[PDB]
């Protein structure tokens, strides 16, 4: 919550690239920041790129929302209205550009109808932005963008929106997600600029490596300007939201394990996790259980919340084994990890026998073989 506080203050101190980013839930935080934004700057309902039909331009989506709020302030209380439809029509008319699979020759006369010379959609959109800022009497606008984890290919489109339409002095941006995915996106695009024949001709180590070098160089020079360092917000993780072993505790969280949990019976967070692990692992209060639960709180927020929200759910259900409840939570939480590990997938075939082979394999990909039977959570692989 302090994260969003400092974010709001900073971007407020951003108006006197123009892109802020949030690494990571990401969507919850972004919605929080938006509502916090409700020094006059206007926000847009966040665009979820992965929730948009497969063929629009991000810019047309933007312009649709823009039409909405602009008309809304316009339906409220005109000589500005007709001027606005002027730019709207000009843009729409010059909207085919990004679209067409070719260039149509008859468009030349349109290209000769009348301050840079041409049908720059960037300047058209910036004129739109100017008109909107005038109309809504705001210093600028923010454009807000959702994680592309469910579809990481679309965000590329958002970035092109950025560079062809978002190089404005009246727009700030706020994106979220993993820059990792943006990285392979942009690098992959880059290779898409290579000529194939060249690729399948000049294909051994020397130039393959130099090509990788040049492409990664461009990737870096590219994303770097795309996301200025000052404008990323780290966002504090859950475990760093909380004392690692009690020598910390910046804003303890506290959670409610029962339905009643009248704001005082909420069983901390760390202590509830420790209980779950210890008596769900028959594990005592040593540090290994402690270190377990720390490496249990290091997991993605949704993962941990789900596995800690089901275990106590079924525990209360049965209260009207802890090690079987917690195992059911782990199974439904990590089935993909266990399933991809080649580990037993069927549930009715559990017995004991499955266990021996299961852990024997586990140590086989965890290497170890010295204390693999410890089943200790210290693999460089998060699964």
């Amino acid at each position: 919550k302090s994260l969003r506080d400092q974010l709001v203050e900073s971007i407020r101190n951003s108006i006197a690239r123009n892109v802020f980013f949030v690494d990571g839930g990401k969507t919850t935080f972004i919605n929080s920041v938006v509502k916090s934004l409700n020094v006059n700057i206007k926000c847009l309902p966040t665009i979820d790129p992965t929730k948009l039909p497969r063929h629009e331009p991000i810019l047309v989506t933007v312009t649709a929302r823009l039409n909405k709020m602009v008309s809304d302030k316009l339906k409220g209380y005109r000589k500005q209205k007709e001027q606005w439809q002027n730019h709207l029509a000009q843009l729409q008319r010059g909207l085919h550009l990004l679209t067409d699979k070719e260039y149509k020759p008859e468009y030349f006369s349109d290209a000769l109808k009348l301050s840079i010379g041409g049908q720059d959609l960037s300047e058209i959109f910036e004129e739109l932005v100017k008109r909107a800022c005038e109309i809504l009497d705001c210093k600028a606008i923010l454009i807000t963008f959702d994680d592309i984890d469910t579809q990481f290919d679309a965000g590329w489109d958002v970035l092109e929106s950025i560079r062809k339409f978002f190089n404005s002095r009246k727009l700030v941006v706020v994106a979220t997600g993993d820059l990792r995915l943006y990285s392979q996106l942009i690098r992959g695009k880059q290779y898409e600029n290579y000529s194939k024949t060249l690729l399948e001709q000049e294909k051994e180590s020397v130039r393959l490596a130099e090509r990788g070098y040049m492409v990664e160089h461009l990737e870096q020079q590219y994303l770097l300007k795309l996301f200025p360092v000052q404008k990323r917000i780290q966002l504090k993780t859950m475990l760093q939201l909380v004392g690692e072993k009690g020598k910390a505790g910046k804003e303890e969280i506290k959670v409610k394990t029962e339905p009643s949990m009248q704001d005082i019976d909420a069983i901390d967070v760390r202590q509830a996790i420790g209980d779950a692990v210890r008596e769900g692992l028959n594990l005592r209060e040593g540090s290994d259980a402690d270190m377990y639960v720390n490496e249990l709180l290091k997991q993605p927020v949704r993962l941990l919340m789900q596995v800690l929200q089901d275990f106590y759910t079924k525990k209360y259900h049965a209260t009207s084994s802890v090690p079987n409840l917690l195992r059911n939570a782990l199974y439904g939480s990590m089935l993909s990890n266990i399933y991809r590990a080649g580990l037993n997938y069927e549930q009715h075939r559990f017995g004991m026998d499955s266990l021996c082979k299961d852990i024997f394999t586990y140590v086989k990909q965890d290497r170890d073989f010295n204390t693999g039977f410890y089943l200790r959570p210290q693999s460089e692989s998060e699964a």
Binding site: L74, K75, Y77, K81, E82, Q85
Partner: protein, 267 residues
Amino acid sequence: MERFLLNSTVLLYRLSTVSLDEVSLDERVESSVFLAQYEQARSLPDHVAKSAWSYLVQQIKQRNMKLGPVAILRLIAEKFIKNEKGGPKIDLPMFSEWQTLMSRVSCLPIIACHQVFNPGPASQEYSFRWPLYPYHPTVEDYITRECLHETHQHLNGSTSAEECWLDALKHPEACLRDFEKGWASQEMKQLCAQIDPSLTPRIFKDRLQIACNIREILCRVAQGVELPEWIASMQNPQQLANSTILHNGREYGFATVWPIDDKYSQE
């Protein structure tokens, strides 16, 4: 062609139904105009219609006006009414045309138009005198010498209709009474359907209330009085079918103050 833009049931329907901030109606207006002219003047050979409308819009744009009753009155007055000797008059050649018009439209708005944007010398205080007339010295001398002689006056009591408009506005409830007591009459049913198919006494009274409200509001603005707040809430024309307006929980009357005691006097 102007006449239709001031007399068109379809135009009224569209304007009344549609909202107040929609803007850019020209296409709808054009369509309504052609439907109307089709209804009244059947014989027009259907292309003179486009020619005339186009010429009108050419006039509006060239004189930098917007489609609207103001520009309509502009064209009408400049076309018809001139100032000569004493007060404004109608040119002799276009007199017959003028009656063809007045058969369908009221002169008073046109007269105000002429006085306002083309007053005669600022020496004759003009007092509204209807109807307007042309000028002929010979005829005028004959009238002075012999005066006229009225034998047949039995149409609308003995007054002209434009007065009955203000009379109903004074007495709208009773006008509604007279309408309804007779609306059951088939002949009245036939006439009402013929002119406005979907009239009914309900929309009769509704239009009456709307007109009263519009008059009060526009008198306020003509006095240039601060555009009272509830206009902001005022968003659909239908809302004027009520004697009042609800802005935020509070109901506001449309009445304003008038310089003249008879708020219904043609003066």
